Amino acid sequence: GPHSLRYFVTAVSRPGLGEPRYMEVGYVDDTEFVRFDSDAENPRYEPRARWMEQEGPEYWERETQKAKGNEQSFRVDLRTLLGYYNQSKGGSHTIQVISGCEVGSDGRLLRGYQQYAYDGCDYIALNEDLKTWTAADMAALITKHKWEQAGEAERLRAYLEGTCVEWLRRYLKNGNATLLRTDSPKAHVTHHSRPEDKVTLRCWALGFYPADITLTWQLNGEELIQDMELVETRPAGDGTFQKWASVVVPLGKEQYYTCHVYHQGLPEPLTLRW
């Protein structure tokens, strides 16, 4: 199916404590594969996935340079925004960026994205056409005027359609054993007593990959997505994920509720009861 390459970029200022902290974390799908943290003793662009061992030393040097270049240039962006917003020179502020592309099974570009945010709010973003920008406020409108004059969209489109897409293909190729694997969810149900003859039934899906999964509770064939409690799918520390969904049912009437787990690792969805 489709695959993606994403970079989450963060720059956080801290007046009185030195230069802004800068971070770059990269992912291929739901798998972290590279990272750069300017607060590390010796700030290097370092691999986060074992298959990234296939990249020569030149790759690491180049990326480490590009990253340090960004750490400096974002220091400049933080000061600039202070001016756009007429803000105090002594407060902490945050610039966030999500950058990357998405490709289908055949390896062609499906989507490209470049999104910035300031202090947790939409600032500017490249539209799906990869030609025009959308500014969230008057401050971003200034940036928009500059980027249009510099042909920034064009430069970003060449990157998305060429560079971004090409490394994504290379990453999937080198890390196929990892990225293209499918770990099947292991499910089970726990039971918990509640006040007034009611019990909480919890369905757990463990050790699955990729992250996308669906957990639904049923009663006589119908779903209960309405009175169902759950948690956003989460990482378990070894490259796999887990999730749980719960529903409150009448005591003694547990056997009438079944859990359904759908995942691309389950040729047939699981169905459990307590």
Binding site: A67, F74, D77, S99, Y123, W147, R155, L156, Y159
Partner: peptide
């Protein structure tokens, strides 16, 4: 590899 970001 991430793109070289442009100034705001």
């Amino acid at each position: 590899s991430s793109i070289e970001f442009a100034r705001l």
